[PDB]
Write an enzyme that holds these catalytic residues in place. Structure first.
Site, PDB file in Angstrom:
ATOM      1  N   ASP A  83       0.808  -1.140  -0.008  1.00 34.41           N
ATOM      2  CA  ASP A  83       0.011   0.075  -0.223  1.00 34.41           C
ATOM      3  C   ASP A  83       0.845   1.282  -0.067  1.00 34.41           C
ATOM      4  O   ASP A  83       2.139   1.309  -0.059  1.00 34.41           O
ATOM      5  CB  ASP A  83      -1.008  -0.151   1.273  1.00 34.41           C
ATOM      6  CG  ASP A  83      -2.204   0.898   1.001  1.00 34.41           C
ATOM      7  OD1 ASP A  83      -2.313   1.615  -0.012  1.00 34.41           O
ATOM      8  OD2 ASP A  83      -3.091   0.901   1.900  1.00 34.41           O
ATOM      9  N   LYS A  84       0.220   2.624  -0.104  1.00 35.62           N
ATOM     10  CA  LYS A  84       0.950   3.545   0.000  1.00 35.62           C
ATOM     11  C   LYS A  84       0.393   4.775   0.888  1.00 35.62           C
ATOM     12  O   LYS A  84      -0.886   4.740   1.154  1.00 35.62           O
ATOM     13  CB  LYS A  84       1.103   4.243  -1.535  1.00 35.62           C
ATOM     14  CG  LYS A  84       1.434   5.816  -1.502  1.00 35.62           C
ATOM     15  CD  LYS A  84      -0.042   6.478  -1.985  1.00 35.62           C
ATOM     16  CE  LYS A  84       0.344   7.882  -2.247  1.00 35.62           C
ATOM     17  NZ  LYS A  84      -0.909   8.737  -2.297  1.00 35.62           N
ATOM     18  N   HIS A  85       0.961   5.656   1.515  1.00 30.96           N
ATOM     19  CA  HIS A  85       0.453   6.537   2.286  1.00 30.96           C
ATOM     20  C   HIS A  85       0.959   7.843   2.050  1.00 30.96           C
ATOM     21  O   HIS A  85       2.320   8.043   1.652  1.00 30.96           O
ATOM     22  CB  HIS A  85       0.318   6.153   3.684  1.00 30.96           C
ATOM     23  CG  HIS A  85      -0.255   7.011   4.551  1.00 30.96           C
ATOM     24  ND1 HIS A  85       0.288   8.146   5.461  1.00 30.96           N
ATOM     25  CD2 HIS A  85      -1.824   7.376   4.825  1.00 30.96           C
ATOM     26  CE1 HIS A  85      -0.920   8.924   6.066  1.00 30.96           C
ATOM     27  NE2 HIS A  85      -1.838   8.367   5.881  1.00 30.96           N
ATOM     28  N   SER A  86       0.094   8.959   2.356  1.00 34.42           N
ATOM     29  CA  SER A  86       0.922  10.287   2.006  1.00 34.42           C
ATOM     30  C   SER A  86       0.534  11.227   2.818  1.00 34.42           C
ATOM     31  O   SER A  86      -0.531  11.200   3.506  1.00 34.42           O
ATOM     32  CB  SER A  86       0.071  10.565   0.565  1.00 34.42           C
ATOM     33  OG  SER A  86       0.266  12.219   0.162  1.00 34.42           O
ATOM     34  N   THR A 123      -9.035  11.187  -0.157  1.00 31.40           N
ATOM     35  CA  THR A 123      -9.136  10.479  -1.174  1.00 31.40           C
ATOM     36  C   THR A 123     -10.804   9.802  -1.181  1.00 31.40           C
ATOM     37  O   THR A 123     -11.533   9.853  -2.130  1.00 31.40           O
ATOM     38  CB  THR A 123      -8.411   9.011  -1.319  1.00 31.40           C
ATOM     39  OG1 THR A 123      -6.817   9.653  -1.682  1.00 31.40           O
ATOM     40  CG2 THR A 123      -8.836   8.212  -2.394  1.00 31.40           C
ATOM     41  N   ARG A 171      -4.121  14.286  21.408  1.00 28.91           N
ATOM     42  CA  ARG A 171      -2.974  15.297  21.051  1.00 28.91           C
ATOM     43  C   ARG A 171      -3.426  16.424  20.393  1.00 28.91           C
ATOM     44  O   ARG A 171      -2.849  17.458  20.360  1.00 28.91           O
ATOM     45  CB  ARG A 171      -2.377  14.385  19.901  1.00 28.91           C
ATOM     46  CG  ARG A 171      -1.464  13.067  20.523  1.00 28.91           C
ATOM     47  CD  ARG A 171      -0.678  12.387  19.419  1.00 28.91           C
ATOM     48  NE  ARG A 171      -0.194  12.998  18.402  1.00 28.91           N
ATOM     49  CZ  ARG A 171      -0.140  12.668  17.227  1.00 28.91           C
ATOM     50  NH1 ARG A 171      -0.511  11.595  16.682  1.00 28.91           N
ATOM     51  NH2 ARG A 171       0.550  13.381  16.197  1.00 28.91           N
ATOM     52  N   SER A 186       0.864   6.810  14.918  1.00 32.49           N
ATOM     53  CA  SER A 186      -0.468   7.009  14.388  1.00 32.49           C
ATOM     54  C   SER A 186      -0.689   6.542  13.044  1.00 32.49           C
ATOM     55  O   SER A 186      -1.406   5.883  12.477  1.00 32.49           O
ATOM     56  CB  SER A 186      -1.171   8.214  14.524  1.00 32.49           C
ATOM     57  OG  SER A 186      -0.797   9.368  13.938  1.00 32.49           O
ATOM     58  N   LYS A 190      -2.349   2.600  11.588  1.00 34.80           N
ATOM     59  CA  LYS A 190      -3.440   2.224  10.543  1.00 34.80           C
ATOM     60  C   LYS A 190      -2.796   1.591   9.412  1.00 34.80           C
ATOM     61  O   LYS A 190      -3.296   0.285   9.365  1.00 34.80           O
ATOM     62  CB  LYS A 190      -3.906   3.584   9.838  1.00 34.80           C
ATOM     63  CG  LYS A 190      -4.323   4.620  11.167  1.00 34.80           C
ATOM     64  CD  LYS A 190      -4.674   5.885  10.534  1.00 34.80           C
ATOM     65  CE  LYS A 190      -4.320   6.755  11.568  1.00 34.80           C
ATOM     66  NZ  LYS A 190      -5.304   6.888  12.555  1.00 34.80           N
ATOM     67  N   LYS A 191      -1.885   2.064   8.594  1.00 35.36           N
ATOM     68  CA  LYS A 191      -1.407   1.376   7.314  1.00 35.36           C
ATOM     69  C   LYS A 191      -1.085  -0.019   7.445  1.00 35.36           C
ATOM     70  O   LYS A 191      -0.657  -0.837   6.867  1.00 35.36           O
ATOM     71  CB  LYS A 191      -0.172   2.095   6.789  1.00 35.36           C
ATOM     72  CG  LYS A 191      -0.708   3.515   6.457  1.00 35.36           C
ATOM     73  CD  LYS A 191      -2.111   3.489   5.614  1.00 35.36           C
ATOM     74  CE  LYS A 191      -2.029   3.022   4.321  1.00 35.36           C
ATOM     75  NZ  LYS A 191      -3.272   3.434   3.698  1.00 35.36           N
TER      76      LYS A 191
HETATM   77  C1  LIG Z   1      -0.771  14.787  12.501  1.00 33.73           C
HETATM   78  C2  LIG Z   1      -1.365  13.127  12.063  1.00 33.73           C
HETATM   79  C3  LIG Z   1      -1.748  13.188  10.634  1.00 33.73           C
HETATM   80  N1  LIG Z   1      -2.430  12.108  10.216  1.00 33.73           N
HETATM   81  C4  LIG Z   1      -2.756  12.086   9.097  1.00 33.73           C
HETATM   82  C5  LIG Z   1      -1.760  11.896   7.927  1.00 33.73           C
HETATM   83  C6  LIG Z   1      -2.482  11.753   6.705  1.00 33.73           C
HETATM   84  O1  LIG Z   1      -2.627  12.938   6.084  1.00 33.73           O
HETATM   85  C7  LIG Z   1      -4.073  11.265   7.223  1.00 33.73           C
HETATM   86  C8  LIG Z   1      -4.542   9.807   6.897  1.00 33.73           C
HETATM   87  O2  LIG Z   1      -6.062   9.941   6.720  1.00 33.73           O
HETATM   88  O3  LIG Z   1      -3.894  11.255   8.448  1.00 33.73           O
HETATM   89  C9  LIG Z   1      -2.468  10.999  11.080  1.00 33.73           C
HETATM   90  O4  LIG Z   1      -2.958   9.961  10.649  1.00 33.73           O
HETATM   91  N2  LIG Z   1      -1.807  10.926  12.112  1.00 33.73           N
HETATM   92  C10 LIG Z   1      -1.201  12.054  12.866  1.00 33.73           C
HETATM   93  O5  LIG Z   1      -0.612  12.081  13.866  1.00 33.73           O
END
Ligand SMILES: Cc1cn([C@H]2C[C@H](O)[C@@H](CO)O2)c(=O)[nH]c1=O
Ligand SMILES: Cc1cn([C@H]2C[C@H](O)[C@@H](CO)O2)c(=O)[nH]c1=O
Ligand SMILES: Cc1cn([C@H]2C[C@H](O)[C@@H](CO)O2)c(=O)[nH]c1=O
Ligand SMILES: Cc1cn([C@H]2C[C@H](O)[C@@H](CO)O2)c(=O)[nH]c1=O
EC number: 2.4.2.4
Lengths: 440, 440
Positions: A83-86, A123, A171, A186, A190-191
């Site tokens: 997968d990919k995260h941005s 997205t 936070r 965080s 998830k990923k």
């Molecule tokens: C600051 C912060 C942003 N995000 C953001 C990054 C990504 O742009 C978004 C993914 O849904 O969540 C987090 O998941 N955890 C965090 O602590």
């Protein structure tokens, strides 16, 4: 019960915590056995004292294991789960292509995404510009799509790293968001719940980015590579530009349109292609669908250029209750703004800067984004035909085409846009689209 | 675009490039209009034909101007903008004391440093052992700190001499690293970008140094001084010794502790002192804050004796978001290893030699630095109480005290330290800490 205070004291005094301590504390976040102020206090000691690699890995694995973790060996897929995260951007449409492309070359891509956060488009809000498109399939529907199509892009279910829900929520009111190991935890919780074999992280750089300076973006990227690999997931990170809009358009429907035209080959933004291809290279190499960069790129051009990638995007949409023929007839289904007019600069000269934060805001102020949930998003509004950094502007060269629901709405976005694009007499230095590849 | 190839051909055939050609070629490297091969060709002709002083100045001013160049005029500061730069070494903590000392004598010292790297460890890693300490203030913060405290140590190298990234990368696969005018421009440009009035360069000499022989160290130093002076920055260099660790510590928290004790006077390793002094003297003189070596030493010694230097370091830590009271209470903030314990030599004799690179590496394996840039640092670990060349060794006189996170790494670092330190039946001869001053 409040033995957490002990774990807080230990970190307040600059000592490393252990897996059992971190695990304990996280599980208490999930269970509500641990107070809000106890989360805030632990959070703020970490901001001051930071964490070590074994702590970081422990914190991510612990948040990741706090909810569901997807299991794939059951289905005997012949390929890697990747997968990919941005960190998000404006015009950051890359996933809509990237998923299909990788699936087209062998990957199985279970993309759990999110909605627009603040000034960045998300997205899920883009895919939901496609009628009947369903971001919440059940386990059966979901696994089958990944098995058949090879890619699916769904919403975050409540069972996904729920420890993080409260953690982040606290936070975000305690000025404890800005902490690289907490951010890293965080994001990766998830990923990694997805059950990945490999991952790539796209960390944005510039005016429209999460992290304000290049080196902070680098820092987060390095941290994520380290921890994710540390967690047993082959991972790379690219530092990519976000000093202007990455696609030629910003919004929801207008970005889905661009994604389709990219995959079919109707039109490919040069800067969007670079950032997209590179991220796709990484997944292929990491998921071992390719030896090096060239074998990766060759295979990815291939499926871009024989319709296979557009084809698999079409199936995915079909799978998630979108139109059967969506790739072929996307204009038949994508909503249109009532009003579509170009906006022109007041001066001559070259574009030297773009306040991307502000453009992102302007799209939200038109209805592309929700300020608070239960706001219905207008999916037709946005910008298209963006001018780019470096570009020469005169009276017949427009900054963008703004799509509004009415004139008052339009006029406001016009102002925002003119205000956010700076022109110099002097043509500025070029900006690469990819800055740095980062590996373990 | 490929006026590039004209320029390569000009240099190739032994002519001197003009300022404007050099500036054109350097900016083309930054913007990526100029191909890698063309860069390689250019470097190799420089490697072969060298460069005149004018060409050298142009080449490094072009790299200097290829990105941001700090302008200090608008703050009407009434002292010199001064900095140190170094080829680096193990236990080289000098910057942490030298910035505070020179600032106490009326200089403004915007130290911008780097990260990552190998056997030798960065200044920013070290400061980051101070909880809360922020190495990335924004520009206005920075000015405010330089204006109010007179020194700041930050890390934003990204927007400085960006042309050098592609330049160095390419040099480093084509065997064109080893060219003094290329080296000089690369080493000097990032530092010249701070907008300095004066500068001192520390070129190490010895087994642990970057240039292998005294002859070559001297050559490099003369080049840097010729160029920096031609670039309008008053510069001298010093050959200083790197045949053993410089400080008594190697690590991060441990080197910050040594630095504070050097400044308060609780402990001053004599070899570190000599070097730190000699370098601070160059700075006051080049920056016209002292008329000669003896006025400078007097001014420097004084701010050590009356705790003023120590106070400047403290205000700096405060201004960069560390604790206000760091200098009075450093043991309260600095991370502490879980295990700290002395290591004894296998045999008895005198310390006759020392592999510093190895020691440096030993500290990295303890987690005190990074093998991979994705790695995270344990700030608490390293060596203290280092024995020195010429020291008499036996069961009552340990090699060093190792600070480790567990007994396994301790036991590992101890073999590394035994192996690195070579004892002998008869005492060795001693050498100076500081060698030749270079004014050219
Ligand atoms: C600051 C912060 C942003 N995000 C953001 C990054 C990504 O742009 C978004 C993914 O849904 O969540 C987090 O998941 N955890 C965090 O602590
Ligand atoms: C065919 C074509 C489309 N576009 C579109 C793609 C997107 O749908 C739109 C977004 O600005 O711009 C171009 O910018 N140039 C082109 O040549
Ligand atoms: C050859 C070369 C080395 N270095 C190295 C030498 C030093 O050991 C270090 C500077 O801190 O980086 C450069 O910065 N630029 C160069 O061109
Ligand atoms: C007081 C004293 C301190 N030190 C050093 C050891 C450690 O490197 C440093 C504390 O970090 O203080 C000596 O080497 N000799 C001394 O006599």
């Amino acid at each position: 019960m409040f033995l957490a205070q002990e774990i807080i004291r230990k970190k307040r005094d600059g000592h490393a915590l252990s897996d059992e301590e971190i695990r304990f504390f996280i599980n208490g976040i999930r269970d509500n056995t641990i107070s809000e102020g106890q989360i805030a206090a632990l959070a703020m000691t970490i901001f001051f004292h930071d964490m070590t690699m074994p702590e970081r890995v422990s914190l991510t694995m612990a948040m990741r294991d706090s909810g569901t973790v997807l299991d794939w060996k059951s289905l005997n897929l012949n390929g890697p789960i990747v997968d990919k995260h941005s960190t998000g951007g404006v015009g950051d449409v890359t996933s809509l292509m990237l998923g299909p492309m990788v699936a087209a070359c062998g990957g199985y891509v279970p993309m759990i995404s999110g909605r627009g956060l603040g000034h960045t488009g998300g997205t899920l809000d883009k895919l939901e510009a496609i009628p009947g498109f369903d971001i919440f399939p059940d386990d059966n529907r979901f696994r089958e799509i990944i098995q058949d199509v090879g890619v699916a892009i769904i919403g975050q279910t409540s069972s996904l790293a729920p420890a993080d829900k409260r953690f982040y929520a606290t936070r975000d009111i305690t000025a404890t968001v800005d902490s690289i190991p907490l951010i890293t935890g965080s994001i990766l919780a998830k990923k990694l719940a997805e059950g990945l074999d490999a991952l790539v992280m796209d960390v944005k750089v510039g005016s429209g980015a999460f992290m304000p300076t290049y080196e902070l973006s680098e820092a987060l990227a390095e941290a994520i590579v380290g921890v994710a690999n540390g967690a047993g997931v082959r991972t790379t990170a690219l530092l990519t530009d976000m000093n202007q809009v990455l696609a030629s358009s910003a919004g929801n429907a207008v970005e889905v349109r661009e994604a389709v035209q990219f995959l079919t080959g109707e039109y490919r933004n040069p800067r969007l292609f670079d950032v997209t291809m590179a991220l796709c290279v990484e997944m292929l190499i990491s998921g071992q669908l390719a030896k090096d960069d060239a074998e990766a790129r060759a295979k990815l051009q291939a499926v871009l250029d024989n319709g296979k990638a557009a084809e698999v995007f079409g199936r995915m949409v079909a799978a998630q209750k979108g139109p059967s023929d969506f790739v072929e007839n996307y204009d038949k289904y994508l909503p249109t703004a009532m009003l579509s007019k170009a906006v022109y600069a007041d001066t001559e000269g070259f574009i030297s800067a773009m306040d991307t934060r502000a453009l992102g805001m302007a799209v939200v102020s038109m209805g592309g984004g929700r300020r608070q949930a239960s706001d219905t998003i207008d999916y037709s509004v946005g910008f298209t035909d963006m001018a780019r950094l470096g570009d020469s502007i005169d009276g017949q060269r427009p900054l963008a085409v703004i799509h509004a629901k009415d004139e008052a709405s339009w006029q406001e976005a016009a102002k925002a846009v003119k205000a956010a694009i700076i022109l110099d007499d002097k043509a500025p230095a070029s900006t690469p689209s990819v800055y740095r590849r980062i590996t373990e």
